[PDB]
Amino acid sequence: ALPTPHEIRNHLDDYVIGQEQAKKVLAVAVYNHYKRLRNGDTSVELGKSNILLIGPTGSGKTLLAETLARLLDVPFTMADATTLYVGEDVENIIQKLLQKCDYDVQKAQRGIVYIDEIDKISRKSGEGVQQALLKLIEGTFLQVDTSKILFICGGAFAGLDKVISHRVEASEGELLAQVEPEDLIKFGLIPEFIGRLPVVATLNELSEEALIQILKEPKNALTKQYQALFNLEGVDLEFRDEALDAIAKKAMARKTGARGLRSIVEAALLDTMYDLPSMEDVEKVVIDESVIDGQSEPLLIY
């Protein structure tokens, strides 16, 4: 049983905050996609229903993609347009989709693929990727057809906010709503590629939980770096969950996104790293009062 767009958007409210319009768009796009897949097209035409996500870094683009897969118990796989002989590395995205699908051709065709940082391959070699990756969107020894699978392409599109303004001539959100296929053309994306991404949802707000993860999960997350720096000091650095969240809020209030996370952590651990080599303690705990208030000093355990 396919979940109605109402139910889809509803469950997205549990994992992602805000972006009500973008989720309303994804709900319909996803619904129509599988409402078409479980129909085998037509025994007539039908809209591919692919998606193009456009939002700031840490707005929840990746989070939304993963959630849509879990809500439909469908095999999900990611891929960066940056890390894309690469014509045989693009087909790798498929074998990975099968890996998490137990090599089931049918369930693999029902899968979802998310390509991050599409805005990075806009020729304005990376251009040729738009074509190699385009070969999948259309559909061609897996024997699996890359037609049935849903393709979601994310990206921040920094300059996109400018091209739209030079055309429509409010806030970035109001501008990204006026986004048009021709705007992405001038940005660097080729016509044949954009025509393959009909649905277009924009994100305007940043996601607290998205930023919180960027501080933890990534192999090179800020916490992991400072914990390694303090580590070679013989001192264990501990970030409390209330602190990480407090860091995410300070980033949003400044609209600096994920790029403004480092500047917040540095200011919080500066005083500590200064007079740290001049002490002899065990570990330094970072609380929320040390971030938000910035009044109290990080706890020190001797």
Summarize the annotated binding site as residue ranges. 56-63
**Binding partner selected for residue 224 from ligand ADP, a copy of itself, none, CB under the kind-specific 5 to 8 Å limit:** a copy of itself
Residue 254 CB, shortest distance to a copy of itself, in Å, is 6
Six token digits for residue 187:
């940005």
Query: Under the criterion CB under 8 A, does residue 166 sit at the interface with a copy of itself?
Result: no
Query: Under the criterion CB under 8 A, does residue 28 sit at the interface with a copy of itself?
Result: yes
DSSP H helices, 18-153, are 20-37, 61-70, 92-99, 105-109, 126-132, 134-138
**Selected binder of a copy of itself within 13, 20, 47, 217 (CB under 8 A):** 47
List the one residue out of 82, 189, 192, 78 whose CA is nearest residue 127. Answer: 189
**Binding partner selected for residue 214 from a copy of itself, ligand ADP, none, CB under the kind-specific 5 to 8 Å limit:** ligand ADP
User: Backbone phi, then psi, for 241, in 5-degree steps?
Assistant: -55, -35
**Selected binder of a copy of itself within 170, 219, 280, 302 (CB under 8 A):** 219
Neighbours of 140 (CB within 10 A): 9
List the one residue out of 187, 189, 170 whose CA is nearest residue 178. Answer: 170
- Give the rounded distance of the alpha carbon of 248 from its chain centre: 16
Q: Which long-range contacts does 211-214 make (Cβ < 8 Å, 24+ apart)?
A: 211/58, 211/247, 211/248, 211/251, 211/252, 211/258, 211/261, 212/244, 212/245, 212/247, 212/248, 213/63, 214/58, 214/258, 214/261
Residue 227 CB, shortest distance to a copy of itself, in Å, is 9
**Binding partner selected for residue 169 from ligand ADP, a copy of itself, none, CB under the kind-specific 5 to 8 Å limit:** none
**Binding partner selected for residue 239 from a copy of itself, ligand ADP, none, CB under the kind-specific 5 to 8 Å limit:** none
Cβ(203)–Cβ(56) under 8 Å? yes
**Which helix (H) or strand (E) element contains residue 268?**
helix 262-274
11-19, 75-83, 237-245, 291-299 -> range binding a copy of itself (CB under 8 A):
75-83
Decide whether 16 or 113 has the Cβ nearer to ligand ADP.
16
Residue 188 CB, shortest distance to a copy of itself, in Å, is 9
**Selected binder of a copy of itself within 106, 171, 220, 295 (CB under 8 A):** 220
- Edge-first strand listing for the sheet containing 150-153: 76-80, 112-116, 150-153, 51-54, 199-202
Query: Under the criterion CB under 8 A, does residue 270 sit at the interface with a copy of itself?
Result: yes
Residue 61 CB, shortest distance to ligand ADP, in Å, is 3
**Selected binder of a copy of itself within 255, 294, 296, 301 (CB under 8 A):** 255
User: Backbone phi, then psi, for 240, in 5-degree steps?
Assistant: -75, 150
Six token digits for residue 279:
């002490």
Residue ranges of the binding site for ATP: 56-63
Six token digits for residue 215:
């501080």
Decide whether 87 or 195 has the Cβ nearer to ligand ADP.
195
Query: Under the criterion CB under 8 A, does residue 73 sit at the interface with a copy of itself?
Result: no
Where do contacts with ligand ADP occur on this chain (CB under 6 A)? 16-17, 55, 57-63, 154, 191, 214, 218, 257-259
Residue 7 CB, shortest distance to a copy of itself, in Å, is 8
133-141, 144-152, 207-215, 280-288 -> range binding a copy of itself (CB under 8 A):
133-141
CA–CA separation, 257 and 32 (whole Å): 32
**Binding partner selected for residue 39 from ligand ADP, a copy of itself, none, CB under the kind-specific 5 to 8 Å limit:** a copy of itself
| Residue 96, CB-side half-sphere exposure with 13 Å CA sphere | 12
